[PDB]
């Protein structure tokens, strides 16, 4: 949810899945896949790369207009 915040920790590009969830800093803003799926409105029924890919698209879609 707090895309604006995660921009400070990881800049433009989001790291790979293995790294994003292994940084202690981003465990406050987004913790584990459950959160991702519950917030995207996705379900456990949607495979995780689909949830991640959707998260990555949101991250780009939202980048502050520059």
């Amino acid at each position: 949810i707090d895309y604006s915040g995660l921009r400070t920790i990881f800049g433009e590009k989001l790291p790979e899945s293995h790294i994003f969830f292994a940084t202690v800093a981003a465990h406050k803003y987004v913790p584990s896949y459950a959160f991702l799926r519950r917030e995207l409105g996705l379900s456990s029924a949607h495979t995780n790369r689909k949830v991640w890919k959707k998260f990555v698209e949101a991250y780009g879609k939202a980048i502050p207009p520059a």
Partner: protein, 51 residues
């Protein structure tokens, strides 16, 4: 020159994810294609981050 520097970071921050551990296989080269002939040894705090 096989010390692959990884995104895992000391002071928590990045934890040692399992992928980082297996991306180590490239540096072996053809040696590491096999998987049945390689042995891994992880530091204790990278077993607690593999979890």
């Amino acid at each position: 020159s096989a010390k692959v520097v990884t995104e895992a970071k000391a002071d928590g921050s990045v934890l040692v994810t399992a992928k980082t551990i297996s991306k180590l296989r490239r540096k072996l080269g053809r040696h590491g294609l096999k998987l049945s002939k390689l042995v891994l040894i992880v530091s204790m705090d990278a077993y607690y981050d593999l979890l």
